[PDB]
């Protein structure tokens, strides 16, 4: 309706601002490609500095999303998880789809709190592509030292 389209205009604007309520507001809305763009920009650069939960820290505070996943319900988790299933297929995108996983495994209990929808197909679907991309970085890691080792 009206507040939906105006809410899409706020979703257009908030991307110029921060990432947190743009992430939750874009999570409750269409479309997940722009949601992939904000995770692309916020998650995209190389950084391994001070304490995060999903690699979200910058000069501007992105650890509020470190809070925002702990409050999130399971419907957005499975609706997120089918998108991670959409993002683990092609190369170089799966890593972005990795970033929430190490997040969500920290936040919720082993039950994936008790009212859990059927997701056996997805949790069965993630793993062989993770083992697939795992051997690649195994190769580049064992090939990285050898240029140093010569001289």
């Amino acid at each position: 309706k009206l507040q939906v389209e105006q809410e899409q205009s706020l979703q257009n604007y908030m991307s110029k601002g921060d990432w947190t309520n743009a992430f939750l507001l874009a999570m409750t809305l269409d479309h997940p490609m722009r949601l992939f763009n904000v995770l692309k920009r916020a998650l995209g650069e190389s950084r391994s500095r001070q304490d995060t939960e999903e690699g979200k820290i910058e000069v501007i505070f992105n650890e509020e999303l470190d809070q925002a996943i702990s409050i999130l319900n399971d419907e957005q988790l499975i609706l997120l998880m089918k998108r991670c299933r959409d993002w683990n297929t092609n190369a170089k995108t799966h890593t972005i789809a990795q970033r929430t996983i190490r997040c969500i495994l920290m936040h919720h209990n082993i039950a994936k709190l008790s009212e859990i929808p059927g997701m056996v197909k997805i949790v069965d679907a993630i793993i062989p592509y993770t083992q697939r991309h795992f051997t690649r970085v195994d190769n580049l890691v064992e090939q990285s030292y050898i240029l140093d080792y010569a001289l």
């Binding site: 009206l2 389209e5 105006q6 205009s9 706020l10 257009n12 604007y13 110029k16 692309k40 920009r41 995209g44 650069e45 190389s46 950084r47 391994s48 170089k92 890593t95 990795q98 970033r99 996983i101 190490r102 495994l105 082993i110 994936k112 056996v120 949790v123 069965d124 993630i126 793993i127 993770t130 083992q131 991309h133 795992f134 690649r136 970085v137 195994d138 580049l140 890691v141 090939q143 990285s144 030292y145 240029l147 140093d148 010569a150 001289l151």
Partner: protein, 778 residues
């Protein structure tokens, strides 16, 4: 052969009626210029033809105009009255000189015609929204790369502030979009409509909107988290336009409910007595409203092919409304409406066109007098040969006798008809009249002066010719066109059984029927050689006939719309076609091919006749006027030489006292060539490069690893190229001396192995974290 007509824009045309107003612009204050099918110049309080800009001979140009046909969308003058600017029914905007009527520039880039066009308060910008659903900003240079704002699906209505920044928009897709000027982004879209925004006006501080929803929404200027203060519901029908007073103490609103009403304590209510008026609002729904520049009147633009003047009840202005004044037309829009029939005299100085309520007398472009008895439009008109009297056929079945001198009817010709008159033409001397009627008979009529017991001035009806009961499946008894033999030997008749029948002057004997017509016929004519004929039908097919039957000479078929009239030449050498699709075509009467295709017609042509002089063209129309006629790796070397040429220059910037590769850092171009290159055969471009390419190359890897950037590249690309160059050459076959880049590699590889080791540890916890709950969920 030789034929008349020209390819020019003007041949002494009177084709512009100066009608159908939709907008206007105020000029000198005592004058006002009007959007019509031209640019017209009127007085603001008298209504006389001050000037008129149309087609013609501009100073220093040929095939140029002052204004076009195909109705003007908007028309306004510049605030310094130096520039003229009109957007037309085509996408091209034309600016014109104010003193002369030469053209200055031509503005295109528009897929559709102009739906918005106005000067800005600076004058150096002209804004034009068109019906291709976007906005185009214009500079005096012609800068269109400034701003092209489009997130729409329909046309736009509302616009500018007066502060060079901070624009607003309301559009016809039910949307009201908010944009900033610096780097435009839709912060917010206020929507309260479901249809089309018809008109728009800001008062001074309150922006009201008028749409299909028959309501009024007020809006505040300094707006965020939408400012709403009220709505004025239900004028009675959807509102169309509004206008503020130049003193900004009132606000007039107009609609298609034949009413206009203003607001005053302005206010959110109408609080002034309105029974003082004497010149009630309008007979036809109006297009646009402007206050007059004399601060005493109101200027109204209606859809009755004319615009008018009134006033608004107030003590400063005139407390009543005056009678509307109209300009000095040439008696082409001084009377009412369209022309369906024309007729020709034999002196080339008496040419009459008829309307719903007028008969207009013309020599070439000068109008003598009017004759008014019309109970409709005329399907046919016919002069007397000699031009003494004229005979009219209205849409009542009534033939009317008019004198040449005055407007008065001498004699009403006997209404023995019960249906309207399709066809009518007189003979050579003009004493026999053959008519079009569905009364299943042919009516002959006498004609002479009034000096006996048989009225020739009232055409007493002695002979009866009736055999019309021929049976068919299309329609038995109706006639469309009648033609008199030029030798005065026979009569040709159009019939609704897809035939024509030929019969001589006396009692019925049969000559010829022509048939083969999929559609019924529109018009039939005879050559003055009197051997071959033509016929026009409703199947877009024009058929030539001589004396045979069933042996088709030629199916003259190249058309798309219906055919109004096709006629021969008055010396029988050129037959011509006027149709529905607004194009008139010359055709050689001896050949099958066309000599000239005249396309300068925008509106519908209903009829067209050429006099026996043959030097001019008379044309009936729907705009009621007459158009008178007569490799990659060397680019990588350039990239590295440019990039190290930047880095070495930035090193000794002030520690010791090119516009494009592309970026704020040139190294982003270095990765971009790695992005642009194909995944195959890149090693052929890499293997060419020497050892100095490596020494220039690793500085960019240290640049991106100290830059911590993985947005524009990825580590298998960098390690992929690294592993290629360590295959190629070399570390100790390129250098035996301990150097700075050699020690740079020893820390860069540590940065790489840690940067990949992070993500590898992330997955190494991720998948084992996924396994464990799947062990439990069983």
């Amino acid at each position: 052969a030789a034929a008349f007509g020209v390819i020019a824009s003007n041949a002494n045309c009177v084709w512009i009626p100066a009608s159908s107003g939709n907008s206007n612009g105020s000029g000198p204050g005592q004058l006002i210029t009007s959007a019509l099918e031209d640019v017209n110049i009127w007085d603001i309080k008298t209504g006389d033809l001050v000037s008129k800009l149309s087609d013609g001979l501009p100073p220093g140009a040929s095939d140029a105009r002052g204004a076009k046909p195909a109705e003007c969308t908007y028309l306004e003058a510049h605030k310094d009255t130096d520039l003229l600017a009109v957007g037309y029914a085509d996408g091209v905007i034309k600016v014109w000189d104010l003193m002369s009527k030469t053209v200055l520039l031509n503005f295109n880039g528009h897929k559709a015609a102009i739906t918005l066009l106005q000067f800005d308060g600076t004058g150096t910008r002209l804004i034009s929204g068109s019906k291709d659903s976007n906005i185009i900003v214009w500079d005096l240079v012609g800068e269109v790369g400034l701003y092209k704002l489009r997130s729409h699906k329909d046309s736009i209505t509302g616009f500018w502030c007066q502060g060079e920044d901070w624009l607003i928009s309301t559009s016809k897709d039910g949307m009201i979009k908010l944009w900033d000027l610096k780097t435009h982004q839709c912060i917010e879209t206020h929507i309260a409509h479901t249809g089309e925004c018809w008109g728009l006006a800001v008062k001074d501080d309150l922006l009201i909107t008028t749409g299909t929803d028959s309501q009024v929404k007020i809006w505040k200027l300094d707006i965020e988290n939408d400012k709403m203060g009220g709505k004025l519901t239900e004028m009675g029908i959807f509102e169309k336009q509004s206008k503020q007073r130049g003193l900004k103490i009132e606000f007039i609103t107009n609609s298609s409910d034949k009413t206009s009403f203003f607001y005053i304590q302005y206010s959110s209510f109408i609080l002034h007595p309105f029974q003082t008026i004497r010149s009630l609002y309008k007979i036809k729904s109006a297009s646009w409203t402007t206050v007059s520049s004399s601060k005493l009147e109101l200027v109204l633009t209606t859809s009755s092919n004319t615009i008018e003047y009134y006033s608004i009840p107030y003590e400063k202005r005139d407390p009543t409304s005056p009678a509307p004044l109209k300009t000095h037309t040439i008696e082409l829009q001084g009377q009412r409406t369209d022309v369906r029939s024309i007729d020709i005299s034999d002196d080339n100085k008496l040419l009459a066109t008829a309307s719903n309520g007028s008969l207009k007398i013309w020599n070439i472009k000068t109008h003598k007098c009017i004759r008014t008895f019309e109970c409709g439009y005329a399907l046919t008109c016919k002069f007397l040969p000699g031009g003494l009297l004229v005979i009219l056929g209205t849409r009542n079945g009534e033939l009317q006798l008019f004198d040449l001198a005055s407007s008065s009817l001498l004699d009403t010709i006997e209404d023995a008809h019960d249906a309207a008159i399709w066809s009518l033409d007189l003979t050579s001397d003009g004493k026999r009249l053959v008519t079009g009627s569905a009364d299943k008979t042919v009516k002959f009529w006498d004609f002479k002066v009034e000096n006996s017991l048989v009225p020739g001035t009232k055409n007493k009806f002695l002979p009866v010719l009736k055999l019309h009961h021929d049976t068919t499946l299309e329609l038995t008894d109706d006639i469309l066109c009648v033609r008199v033999s030029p030798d005065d030997r026979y009569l040709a008749i159009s019939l609704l059984d897809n035939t024509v029948k030929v019969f001589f002057l006396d009692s019925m004997k049969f000559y010829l029927s022509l048939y083969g017509h999929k559609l019924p016929v529109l018009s039939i004519d005879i050559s003055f050689d009197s051997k071959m004929i033509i016929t026009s039908s409703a199947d877009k097919n024009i058929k030539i006939w001589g004396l045979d039957f069933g042996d088709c000479h030629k199916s003259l078929f190249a058309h798309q719309d219906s055919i109004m009239n096709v006629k021969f030449l008055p010396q029988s050498h050129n037959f011509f076609s006027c149709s529905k699709d607004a194009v008139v075509k010359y055709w050689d009467g001896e050949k099958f091919e066309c000599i000239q295709k005249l396309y300068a017609h925008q509106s519908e042509v209903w009829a067209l006749a050429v006099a026996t002089d043959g030097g001019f063209v008379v044309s009936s129309s729907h705009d009621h006027s007459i158009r008178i006629w007569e490799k990659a790796g060397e680019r990588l070397m350039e990239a590295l030489d440019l990039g190290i040429a930047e880095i070495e220059g930035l090193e000794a910037y002030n520690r010791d006292m090119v516009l494009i590769a592309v970026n704020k850092t040139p190294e982003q171009y270095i990765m971009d060539t790695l992005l642009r290159i194909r995944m195959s055969q890149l090693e052929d471009a890499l293997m060419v490069m020497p050892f100095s390419y490596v020494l220039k190359f690793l500085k960019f890897i240290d640049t991106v690893m100290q830059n911590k950037t993985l947005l524009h590249s990825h580590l298998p690309l960098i390690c992929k190229n690294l592993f290629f160059i360590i295959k190629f050459n070399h570390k100790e076959l390129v250098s035996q001396k301990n150097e700075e880049l050699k020690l740079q590699i020893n820390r860069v590889k540590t940065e790489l192995r840690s940067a990949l080791k992070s993500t590898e540890d992330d997955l190494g916890f991720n998948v084992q974290g996924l396994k464990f709950v799947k062990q439990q969920w069983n």
